[PDB]
Design a protein around this motif. Structure first.
Motif, PDB file in Angstrom:
ATOM      1  N   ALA A  34       0.823  -1.204   0.000  1.00  0.00           N
ATOM      2  CA  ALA A  34       0.000   0.000   0.000  1.00  0.00           C
ATOM      3  C   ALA A  34       0.859   1.256   0.000  1.00  0.00           C
ATOM      4  O   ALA A  34       0.579   2.205  -0.740  1.00  0.00           O
ATOM      5  CB  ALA A  34      -0.939  -0.011   1.202  1.00  0.00           C
ATOM      6  N   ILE A  35       1.931   1.270   0.790  1.00  0.00           N
ATOM      7  CA  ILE A  35       2.809   2.435   0.830  1.00  0.00           C
ATOM      8  C   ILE A  35       3.625   2.546  -0.450  1.00  0.00           C
ATOM      9  O   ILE A  35       3.809   3.643  -0.991  1.00  0.00           O
ATOM     10  CB  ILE A  35       3.709   2.373   2.073  1.00  0.00           C
ATOM     11  CG1 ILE A  35       2.864   2.155   3.325  1.00  0.00           C
ATOM     12  CG2 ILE A  35       4.513   3.648   2.204  1.00  0.00           C
ATOM     13  CD1 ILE A  35       3.667   1.734   4.526  1.00  0.00           C
ATOM     14  N   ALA A  36       4.146   1.424  -0.946  1.00  0.00           N
ATOM     15  CA  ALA A  36       4.851   1.453  -2.220  1.00  0.00           C
ATOM     16  C   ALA A  36       3.944   1.957  -3.335  1.00  0.00           C
ATOM     17  O   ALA A  36       4.361   2.771  -4.167  1.00  0.00           O
ATOM     18  CB  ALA A  36       5.396   0.066  -2.551  1.00  0.00           C
ATOM     19  N   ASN A  37       2.695   1.491  -3.363  1.00  0.00           N
ATOM     20  CA  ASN A  37       1.773   1.951  -4.392  1.00  0.00           C
ATOM     21  C   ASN A  37       1.440   3.423  -4.213  1.00  0.00           C
ATOM     22  O   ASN A  37       1.248   4.144  -5.197  1.00  0.00           O
ATOM     23  CB  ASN A  37       0.507   1.102  -4.373  1.00  0.00           C
ATOM     24  CG  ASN A  37      -0.302   1.244  -5.635  1.00  0.00           C
ATOM     25  OD1 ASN A  37       0.224   1.121  -6.737  1.00  0.00           O
ATOM     26  ND2 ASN A  37      -1.589   1.510  -5.484  1.00  0.00           N
ATOM     27  N   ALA A  38       1.365   3.894  -2.967  1.00  0.00           N
ATOM     28  CA  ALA A  38       1.160   5.320  -2.737  1.00  0.00           C
ATOM     29  C   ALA A  38       2.310   6.132  -3.311  1.00  0.00           C
ATOM     30  O   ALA A  38       2.088   7.161  -3.955  1.00  0.00           O
ATOM     31  CB  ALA A  38       1.005   5.596  -1.244  1.00  0.00           C
ATOM     32  N   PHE A  39       3.544   5.682  -3.094  1.00  0.00           N
ATOM     33  CA  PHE A  39       4.696   6.389  -3.649  1.00  0.00           C
ATOM     34  C   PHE A  39       4.659   6.388  -5.171  1.00  0.00           C
ATOM     35  O   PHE A  39       4.915   7.414  -5.813  1.00  0.00           O
ATOM     36  CB  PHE A  39       5.996   5.762  -3.143  1.00  0.00           C
ATOM     37  CG  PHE A  39       6.244   5.972  -1.678  1.00  0.00           C
ATOM     38  CD1 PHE A  39       5.670   7.037  -1.009  1.00  0.00           C
ATOM     39  CD2 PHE A  39       7.052   5.103  -0.970  1.00  0.00           C
ATOM     40  CE1 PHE A  39       5.897   7.229   0.338  1.00  0.00           C
ATOM     41  CE2 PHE A  39       7.282   5.291   0.374  1.00  0.00           C
ATOM     42  CZ  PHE A  39       6.704   6.355   1.029  1.00  0.00           C
ATOM     43  N   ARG A  40       4.336   5.240  -5.768  1.00  0.00           N
ATOM     44  CA  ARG A  40       4.289   5.149  -7.225  1.00  0.00           C
ATOM     45  C   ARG A  40       3.218   6.064  -7.807  1.00  0.00           C
ATOM     46  O   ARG A  40       3.457   6.758  -8.802  1.00  0.00           O
ATOM     47  CB  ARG A  40       4.049   3.700  -7.643  1.00  0.00           C
ATOM     48  CG  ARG A  40       4.018   3.472  -9.132  1.00  0.00           C
ATOM     49  CD  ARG A  40       3.296   2.186  -9.466  1.00  0.00           C
ATOM     50  NE  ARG A  40       1.867   2.281  -9.196  1.00  0.00           N
ATOM     51  CZ  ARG A  40       0.951   2.572 -10.112  1.00  0.00           C
ATOM     52  NH1 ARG A  40       1.313   2.798 -11.364  1.00  0.00           N
ATOM     53  NH2 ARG A  40      -0.327   2.635  -9.777  1.00  0.00           N
ATOM     54  N   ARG A  41       2.032   6.091  -7.196  1.00  0.00           N
ATOM     55  CA  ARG A  41       0.957   6.931  -7.712  1.00  0.00           C
ATOM     56  C   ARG A  41       1.236   8.406  -7.460  1.00  0.00           C
ATOM     57  O   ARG A  41       0.832   9.262  -8.254  1.00  0.00           O
ATOM     58  CB  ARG A  41      -0.371   6.523  -7.081  1.00  0.00           C
ATOM     59  CG  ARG A  41      -0.687   5.050  -7.199  1.00  0.00           C
ATOM     60  CD  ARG A  41      -1.976   4.714  -6.482  1.00  0.00           C
ATOM     61  NE  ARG A  41      -2.997   5.732  -6.696  1.00  0.00           N
ATOM     62  CZ  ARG A  41      -4.110   5.537  -7.388  1.00  0.00           C
ATOM     63  NH1 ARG A  41      -4.348   4.358  -7.939  1.00  0.00           N
ATOM     64  NH2 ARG A  41      -4.985   6.519  -7.536  1.00  0.00           N
ATOM     65  N   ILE A  42       2.047   8.739  -6.472  1.00  0.00           N
ATOM     66  CA  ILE A  42       2.398  10.174  -6.257  1.00  0.00           C
ATOM     67  C   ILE A  42       3.294  10.651  -7.390  1.00  0.00           C
ATOM     68  O   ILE A  42       3.038  11.714  -7.916  1.00  0.00           O
ATOM     69  CB  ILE A  42       3.001  10.466  -4.877  1.00  0.00           C
ATOM     70  CG1 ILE A  42       2.044  10.140  -3.733  1.00  0.00           C
ATOM     71  CG2 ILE A  42       3.437  11.911  -4.802  1.00  0.00           C
ATOM     72  CD1 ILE A  42       0.980  11.174  -3.510  1.00  0.00           C
ATOM     73  N   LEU A  43       4.295   9.887  -7.769  1.00  0.00           N
ATOM     74  CA  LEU A  43       5.233  10.329  -8.808  1.00  0.00           C
ATOM     75  C   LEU A  43       4.486  10.504 -10.128  1.00  0.00           C
ATOM     76  O   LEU A  43       4.635  11.560 -10.738  1.00  0.00           O
ATOM     77  CB  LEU A  43       6.369   9.312  -8.861  1.00  0.00           C
ATOM     78  CG  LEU A  43       7.439   9.476  -7.795  1.00  0.00           C
ATOM     79  CD1 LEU A  43       8.075   8.144  -7.459  1.00  0.00           C
ATOM     80  CD2 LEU A  43       8.487  10.461  -8.259  1.00  0.00           C
ATOM     81  N   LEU A  44       3.649   9.558 -10.516  1.00  0.00           N
ATOM     82  CA  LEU A  44       2.891   9.639 -11.785  1.00  0.00           C
ATOM     83  C   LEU A  44       1.899  10.793 -11.774  1.00  0.00           C
ATOM     84  O   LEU A  44       1.881  11.510 -12.741  1.00  0.00           O
ATOM     85  CB  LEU A  44       2.161   8.322 -12.050  1.00  0.00           C
ATOM     86  CG  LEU A  44       3.014   7.106 -12.381  1.00  0.00           C
ATOM     87  CD1 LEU A  44       2.122   5.892 -12.538  1.00  0.00           C
ATOM     88  CD2 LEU A  44       3.802   7.337 -13.654  1.00  0.00           C
ATOM     89  N   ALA A  45       1.154  10.985 -10.698  1.00  0.00           N
ATOM     90  CA  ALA A  45       0.079  11.985 -10.746  1.00  0.00           C
ATOM     91  C   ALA A  45       0.039  13.096  -9.705  1.00  0.00           C
ATOM     92  O   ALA A  45      -0.961  13.757  -9.697  1.00  0.00           O
ATOM     93  CB  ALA A  45      -1.203  11.260 -10.703  1.00  0.00           C
ATOM     94  N   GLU A  46       1.000  13.272  -8.815  1.00  0.00           N
ATOM     95  CA  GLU A  46       0.829  14.375  -7.837  1.00  0.00           C
ATOM     96  C   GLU A  46       2.064  15.251  -7.632  1.00  0.00           C
ATOM     97  O   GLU A  46       1.903  16.251  -6.945  1.00  0.00           O
ATOM     98  CB  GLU A  46       0.304  13.889  -6.495  1.00  0.00           C
ATOM     99  CG  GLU A  46      -0.945  13.043  -6.559  1.00  0.00           C
ATOM    100  CD  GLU A  46      -2.175  13.775  -6.067  1.00  0.00           C
ATOM    101  OE1 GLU A  46      -2.145  15.017  -6.037  1.00  0.00           O
ATOM    102  OE2 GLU A  46      -3.147  13.100  -5.697  1.00  0.00           O
TER     103      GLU A  46
END
Lengths: 49, 51
Positions: free
Chosen positions: A21-33
């Motif tokens: 969940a935390i790894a996916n949060a980091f990945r989705r931050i770089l792509l979209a935030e």
């Protein structure tokens, strides 16, 4: 955290010992935030192209 | 002194001009059959994983 490579425009760290969940949060931050600057408006005085 | 009917013909000949058949060779196609699509030699992977 362990980094396999760091050229310019690349990184390959490891990030050992974290949940999906935390790894996916980091990945989705770089792509979209993470913010960037880009052209939004274009004023065209002439364009015979 | 006129023309009179003479004896009936005894036979008829019908002539026509005809050429003959050659040997059967049956050469179907220049490059024949549907040649199969196939592997480029060696190729090699054009992609690797990260790390």
């Amino acid at each position: 955290v362990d980094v396999v490579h760091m050229d310019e425009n690349s990184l390959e760290f490891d990030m050992v010992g974290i949940d999906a969940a935390i790894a996916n949060a980091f990945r989705r931050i770089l792509l979209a935030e993470v913010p960037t600057m880009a052209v939004e408006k274009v004023l065209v005085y002439n364009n015979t192209s | 002194g006129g023309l009179t009917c003479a004896s009936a013909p005894q036979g008829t000949l019908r002539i026509l001009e005809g050429p003959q058949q050659s040997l059967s060779g049956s050469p179907l196609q220049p490059i024949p059959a549907s040649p199969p699509p196939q592997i480029p030699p060696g190729l090699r992977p054009r992609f690797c994983a990260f790390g």
